Amino acid sequence: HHEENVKRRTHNVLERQRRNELKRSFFALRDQIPELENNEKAPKVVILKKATAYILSVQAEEQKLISEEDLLRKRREQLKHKLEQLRNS
């Protein structure tokens, strides 16, 4: 029974260390989500779900910015072409 006691206490320490590491990982993710930053009562499920939603939002934002830049680049080429036509007339 002493071996079972030593094993139980050893596993208890290891499990606490793993829980603490996991908590730090949750908090680092939480802190990338502006709505949750430094909220020490943010539940795990809320961090996970808000992270997924935030990823979708940042990806949609990227697509919006890519579209804006594409139109600006097409416009730049059109302007450069107009300037070249004008200067060579």
Partner: protein, 76 residues
């Protein structure tokens, strides 16, 4: 019984949410990942994407300045 039912639903909702998050992260899409790996790779991805959108906006601001200048040279 009611309390065990609440607890199992709680655990299942966390499992579902880990899967959804993992499936949202390109570096993990299609791979085997522990809970710690999913969290850490999602953190890195969000940090990267937030900065990347700043890089895109900088390029957009550079291009808007470039096109205004070209419009001024066409007007002249």
């Amino acid at each position: 019984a009611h309390h065990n039912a609440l607890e199992r639903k709680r655990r299942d909702h966390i499992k579902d949410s880990f899967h959804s998050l993992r499936d949202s992260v390109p570096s993990l899409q299609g791979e085997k990942a522990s809970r710690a790996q999913i969290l850490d790779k999602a953190t890195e991805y969000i940090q990267y994407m937030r900065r990347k959108n700043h890089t895109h906006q900088q390029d957009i601001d550079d291009l808007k300045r470039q096109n205004a200048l070209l419009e001024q040279q066409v007007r002249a």
